[PDB]
């Protein structure tokens, strides 16, 4: 309605600083809630080997990557390229 | 005749019909909880 | 003082003990003493008279070093056997600085010289909280350490609290310090027992809270902080006497009233744990806690002191007491001894 | 009603009232032993839980 | 380590020996209260560090906020003493004792 | 709900209600100078309401049936018996006053509820702060101990600063050989036979202590009796009264809250008038008092709260 | 002291065991006492505010006479567990440890003396 | 009738009755060694109880 769009335009001109604050406040929190790429914040950040990946010994199970890792099994992340 | 007209002149009908309605519930939930217990006390053990 | 400020401070007072309750580290269990401390100084100081500004400093310095001295023992306990809890095999001096500190939070042996002084020069509301709620979080430290306090000194603090918590109670004539000096003398019972079945001091706290609140809630009705200022209650509200009578004689334990029960059931632990010589002293000098109640009650009901002519106005103004607060407590005490099996 | 109803009533109390002495002397002595050698449920003071440790690899021997 | 712990625990002990003795002030009392803090801070920084207890490493901040949050109001009182007396002596406030 | 604190959050504010004429206002003078044709004829000229002088019985006239009572139920003043014989050990010269002090204090306190609810001005007359005028002349002459005056100013010390000033007082000076004449011009024998010196010590102590210390908190409108008798001019003198130099301005709506919950509890207004302090002049003793309060609750109408009395109505005397 | 035992649902008032216990009678020395105890409260609240004693709520009373009784039922319905576990835990400890609680209660008063302290 | 200016006179004897019942509820609570006492130990005629 017109009762609010005046206070917008009015409080804007007489205080056009806090609006950018009260915007960026509520606007910083809405954009993650609508993004496609927010999922990748953790993926990219979970794939980071700051620590040696300790291996595991074959018991004739877990059909995952072989010893020589150059086998496409396992999470051979290629999405990160051509992100 | 109470020149300063008191805060309690008419009954607070909001609360009295509300308090009693709480008590009666407080009576019945108690009882049905007891008989349920005495009932279940029997079949929980042998009898 | 602004409601936006009120329900954020009453909030913090409620958090300090509860954080202290609802936590396992000795660190969350420390900070909780500080929400309990940071949220008192605001309301100790509302009138902003000198008699409030002096108490806070006299309260703050006394109840900061205590926080530090607690805060020492943790760090020692994180050097020694690195973790954040008094586990079992921690050195005795550590606790004997912990218990030292809590005894400064509460006021037992010489550490009581501040508590009534603070309780003097203060409103009753926010005087109520020093003695009933703020008193818990120090104990929330302490029911944790069920065994393993040095039984030697924890008893020394009791008697010296019972002595000083009584003799001091004789001289004084303002309600505010008497109710305070009994907080001491109703602590050695909270405290002597403490290694010996401390689901029984938890009681005396749930008791002693039930006995002080009605009194303050009674003094709040008239804002009378003095024997004479309350002596003339027969003119103001001669109906409140029959509870203040039963409230006090309950508070200093006489049997048919409930307040005997902690002072009795405690001794049922202590004699059972082989200390004939000691606990006798408490119950005897406890009778001295009746003398400045039996002198008090003389001023109150048992002979109607002289009053002021100006009180004739006071019998026109339709006083208003609270509900759920005074009678509902004043009869959960003074009449509830014979449910003691159910209490305990 | 009669002494046939007293003398018998009294013994009923004694069976009720003597038994109490035995239980308390037991219930104390139990409470004594369950402390000095914490073996029963009473006076089992808590220790930190197993299930807030990571059993995973961190760095070579930990 | 131990060649600095006991040296700190002594320095702490002086700070406690300190804030229990007065010489005609409240601030020095109020101020020696923070060597009592800071000597506990460091001795918490060391143990949580030399133990490689990076999980306990948050705690030195949690204390250090309240190393000041209590202190700040502690400062705030003095303005409400000096505004009363204007002197900041501890021997000026002996009238809660009547 | 008795204004609570909820009503301050839901909205029961004061500054939303105030007015240019939401101004408490007082008149002062002497014992037959104006104030009955002045005070009335000012509330009406402007729009606000009016309160008369505080009688001995203003407490009784404002509760229950609003009726007056026996002397003993309302102090033991007997102002009529004051003038014809003071200097008795049956101390009447102070009881006459403190009993009136509290009543002025209640009257002033009765104002602030209505001043702070449907905010209108409040015409008082000889409010609290002019009350020592009666005492100074009364101690400068032989009527009261020195030890008993301190019992007054001590009680004044406890209740006066807890309230606001009277907000533009008025005083009508008048020469003492005239006011002694107006008493004779009125058909009262008791107001006669008063020492004219007392009515000269009345206003010489007035203008030395009252008048100066009030011109700084409030704003005075000193007038003469013939400058009165024409309340048209003074009404418009109020209009040019630029309100400053008082504590009304240095306090938000929340002081009014703790000011208004202080005053709605009329019993809490007076906890520092029934102080334990014991004089032979005002301390009564037990039986003399117990007899009264017991006979006073037997009275037809109190006996109980002022909500529950079968004998003056109160049909539903078992729920409400 | 009980609080650390096994079989412990902490902060479960009414553990959902104790449901195998016989509940109260509704008519015992303590609830009906607690009932009168509630009545003596509303008696006194009115007596403090200068209302007519023995009347003047007639719903406030009935609240207290229930609010305690409704409370006294559950609270009694708890402690009756606590004493029961205070017994249950005890005797079980005794049968897992018979080696330390023997029973030889005494001989008769014929194979035994007491010093006849005459007067 | 009228507003029952005297009804308390019913009040006390309702207690003596209630006491004689509570005194009797005590009795059937104990109700043991009804005949197992060495002293009496008398088997009755064909009928049922003693106390
Ligand atoms: N403490 C007191 N001592 C003497 N007279 C008093 C006192 N308090 C009130 N009065 C009386 O109040 C009266 C006021 O009457 P008057 O000035 O004629 O009209 P108004 O009632 O408008 O002031 C005076 O006659 C005065 O004697």
Concise structural overview:
Chain C is mainly α and 344 residues long. Chain C is 64% helix and 0% strand.
What does this structure look like?
The structure is cut from a larger assembly and holds eight protein chains of eight kinds. Chain D has 62 residues and is mostly helical. Chain D has one helix at residues 3-36. The longest helix of chain F is centred in the N-terminal third of the chain and has 21 residues, at 95-115. Chain F is mostly helical and 320 residues long. In chain F, the strands form two sheets. In chain F, strands 1-3-2 form a three-stranded parallel β-sheet. Chain F has a two-stranded parallel ribbon with strand order 4-5. Chain H has 51 residues and is an all-alpha fold. Chain H has one domain (1-51). Helix content of chain H is 35%, strand content 0%. Chain H contains one helix and no strands. Chain H is rod-shaped, with a radius of gyration of 20 Å. Classes of the chains: A mainly alpha (83), B mainly alpha (47), C mainly alpha (344), D mainly alpha (62), E mainly alpha (98), F mainly alpha (320), G mainly alpha (119), H mainly alpha (51). Chains in contact: B-F, B-G, C-D, C-E, C-F, C-G, D-G, D-H, F-G. Bound molecules: adenosine-5'-diphosphate. The PDB classes it as oxidoreductase. Keywords: Complex I, mitochondria, proton pump, membrane protein. Mouse mitochondrial complex I in the deactive state.
């Amino acid at each position: 309605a017109g009762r609010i769009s005046a206070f917008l335009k009015n409080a804007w001109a007489k205080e056009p600083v806090l609006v950018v604050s009260f915007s960026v406040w509520g606007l910083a929190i809405i954009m993650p809630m609508i993004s496609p790429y927010t999922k990748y914040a953790s993926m990219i950040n979970k794939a980071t080997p700051y620590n040696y990946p300790v291996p595991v010994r074959d018991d004739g199970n877990m059909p995952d990557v072989p010893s020589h890792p150059q086998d496409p099994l396992g999470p051979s992340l290629d999405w990160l390229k051509n992100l | 005749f109470y020149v300063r007209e008191p805060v309690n002149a008419k009954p607070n009908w909001l609360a009295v019909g509300l308090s009693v309605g709480a008590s009666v519930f407080m009576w019945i939930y108690l009882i049905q909880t007891h008989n349920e217990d005495v009932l279940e006390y029997k079949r929980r053990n042998g009898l | 003082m602004n409601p936006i400020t009120l329900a954020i401070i009453y909030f913090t007072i409620f958090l300090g003990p509860v954080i202290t309750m609802s936590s396992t580290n000795l660190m969350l269990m420390w900070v909780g003493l500080e929400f309990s401390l940071l949220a008192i100084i605001p309301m100790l100081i509302n009138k902003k008279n000198p008699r409030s500004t002096e108490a806070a400093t006299k309260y703050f310095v006394t109840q900061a070093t205590a926080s530090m001295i607690i805060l020492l023992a943790i760090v020692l306990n994180y050097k020694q056997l690195g973790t954040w809890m008094f586990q079992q095999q921690t050195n005795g001096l550590i606790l004997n600085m912990t218990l030292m500190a809590l005894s400064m939070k509460l006021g037992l042996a010489p550490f009581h010289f501040w508590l009534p002084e603070v309780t003097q020069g203060i409103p009753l509301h926010m005087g109520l909280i020093l003695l009933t709620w703020q008193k818990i979080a120090p104990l929330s430290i302490l029911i944790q350490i069920y065994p393993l306090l040095n039984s030697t000194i924890i008893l020394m603090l009791a008697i010296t609290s019972i002595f000083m918590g009584a003799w001091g109670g004789l001289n004084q004539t303002q309600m505010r310090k008497i109710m305070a000096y009994s907080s001491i003398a109703h602590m050695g019972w909270m405290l002597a027992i403490l290694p010996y079945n401390p689901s029984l001091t938890l009681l005396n706290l749930m008791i002693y809270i039930i006995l002080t609140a009605p009194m303050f809630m009674a003094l709040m009705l008239n804002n009378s902080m003095t024997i004479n200022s309350i002596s003339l209650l027969w003119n103001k509200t001669p109906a409140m006497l029959t509870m203040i009578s039963l409230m006090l004689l309950s508070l200093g334990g006489l049997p048919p009233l409930t307040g005997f029960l902690p002072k009795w059931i405690i001794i049922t632990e202590l004699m059972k744990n082989n200390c004939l010589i000691m606990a006798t002293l408490m119950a005897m000098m406890a009778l001295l806690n009746l003398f400045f109640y039996t002198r008090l009650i003389y001023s109150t009901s048992l002979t109607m002191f002289p009053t002021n002519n100006n009180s004739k106005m006071m019998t026109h103004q339709t006083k208003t007491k609270p509900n759920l607060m005074f009678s509902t407590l004043a009869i959960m005490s003074t009449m509830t001894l014979p449910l003691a099996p159910q209490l305990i | 009603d009669g002494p046939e109803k007293n003398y018998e009533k009294t013994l009923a109390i004694l069976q009720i009232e003597s038994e109490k002495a035995e239980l308390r002397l037991k219930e104390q002595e139990v409470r004594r032993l369950m402390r000095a050698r914490g073996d029963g449920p009473w006076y089992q003071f808590p220790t930190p839980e197993k299930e807030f440790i990571d059993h995973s690899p961190k760095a070579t021997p930990d | 380590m131990p060649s600095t712990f006991f040296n700190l625990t002594m320095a702490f002990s002086l700070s406690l020996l300190g804030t229990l003795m007065f010489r005609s002030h409240l601030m020095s009392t109020l101020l020696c209260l923070e060597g009592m803090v800071l000597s506990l801070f460091i001795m918490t920084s060391v143990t949580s560090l030399n133990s490689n207890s990076m999980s306990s490493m948050p705690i030195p901040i949690t204390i250090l906020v309240f190393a000041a949050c209590e202190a700040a109001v502690g400062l705030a009182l003095l303005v409400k003493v000096s505004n009363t007396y204007g002197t900041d002596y501890v021997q000026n406030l002996n009238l809660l004792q009547c | 709900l008795r204004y609570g604190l909820l009503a301050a959050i839901l909205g029961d504010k004061t500054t939303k209600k105030l007015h240019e004429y939401s101004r408490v206002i007082t008149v002062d003078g002497n014992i037959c100078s104006g104030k009955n044709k002045l005070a009335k004829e000012i509330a009406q000229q402007l729009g606000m309401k009016h309160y008369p002088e505080a009688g001995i019985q203003y407490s009784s006239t404002t509760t229950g049936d609003g009726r007056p009572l026996d002397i003993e139920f309302s102090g033991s003043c007997s102002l009529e018996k004051f003038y014809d014989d003071p200097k008795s050990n049956d101390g009447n010269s102070y009881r006459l006053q403190s009993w009136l002090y509290a009543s002025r204090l209640l009257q002033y306190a009765d104002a602030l509820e209505h001043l702070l609810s449907t905010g209108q001005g409040v015409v008082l007359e000889r409010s609290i702060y002019s009350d020592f005028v009666f005492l100074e002349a009364m101690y400068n002459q032989g009527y009261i101990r020195k030890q008993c005056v301190d019992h007054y100013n001590e009680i004044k010390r406890l209740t006066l600063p807890e309230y606001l000033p009277p907000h533009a007082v008025i005083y009508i000076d008048v020469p003492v050989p005239e006011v002694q004449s107006r008493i004779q011009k009125k058909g009262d024998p008791h107001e006669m036979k008063v020492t004219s010196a007392y009515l000269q010590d009345i206003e010489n102590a007035y203008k030395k202590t009252f008048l100066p210390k009030m011109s700084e908190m409030c704003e005075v409108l000193v007038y003469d009796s013939w400058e009165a008798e024409d309340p048209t001019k003074v009404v418009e003198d109020i209009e040019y009264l630029k309100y400053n130099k008082g504590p009304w301005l240095k306090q938000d709506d929340w002081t009014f809250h703790y000011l208004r919950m202080l005053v709605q509890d009329k019993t809490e207004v007076l906890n520092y008038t029934t102080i334990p302090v014991y004089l032979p002049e005002i301390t009564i003793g037990a039986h003399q008092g117990s007899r009264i309060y017991n006979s006073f609750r037997e009275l037809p109408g109190r006996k109980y709260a002022p909500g529950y009395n079968a004998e003056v109505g109160d049909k539903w005397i078992w729920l409400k | 002291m009980m609080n650390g035992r096994p079989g412990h649902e902490p902060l479960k008032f009414l553990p959902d065991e104790a449901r195998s216990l016989p509940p109260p009678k509704l008519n015992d020395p303590r609830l009906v006492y607690m009932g009168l105890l509630g009545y003596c409260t509303g008696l006194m609240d009115n007596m403090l505010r200068m209302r007519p004693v023995m009347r003047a709520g007639l719903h406030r009373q009935l609240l207290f006479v229930t609010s305690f009784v409704f409370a006294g039922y559950f609270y009694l319905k708890r402690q009756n567990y606590l004493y029961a576990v205070k017994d249950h835990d005890m005797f079980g400890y005794i049968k897992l440890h018979p080696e330390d609680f023997p029973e030889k209660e005494k001989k008769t008063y014929a194979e035994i003396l007491e010093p006849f302290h005459p007067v | 009738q009228l507003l029952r200016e005297h009804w308390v006179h019913i009040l006390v004897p309702a207690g003596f009755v209630f006491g004689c019942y509570l005194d009797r509820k005590d009795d059937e609570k104990l109700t043991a060694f009804r005949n197992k006492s060495m002293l009496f130990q008398r088997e009755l005629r064909p009928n049922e109880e003693v106390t």
